[PDB]
Amino acid sequence: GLIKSLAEKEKQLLERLEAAKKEAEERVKRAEAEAKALLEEAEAKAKA
């Protein structure tokens, strides 16, 4: 073979992990935001 096939493929296999970490974090952050704001509404309401 030729190492330029697998050399330039590795740097796509690397992107397939990377985009994975993104959409893991950026989803669990939204839920935490939805929980925070929900329990704030539960104060605003309780006190009212």
Binding residues for another protein, rule: CB under 8 A, are 1-3, 6-7, 10, 13
Question: Structure tokens of 23?
Answer: 């959409």
Cβ proximity to another protein: between 5 and 39 the closer is 5
Separation of alpha carbons 15 and 24, rounded Å: 14
Please say which residue, 8 or 43, places its beta carbon nearer to another protein. Answer: 8
- Least separation in angstroms between residue 1's CB and another protein is 4
Q: How far is the CB of 28 from another protein (least distance, A)?
A: 26
Name the nearest CA neighbour of 46 among 34, 36, 38: 38
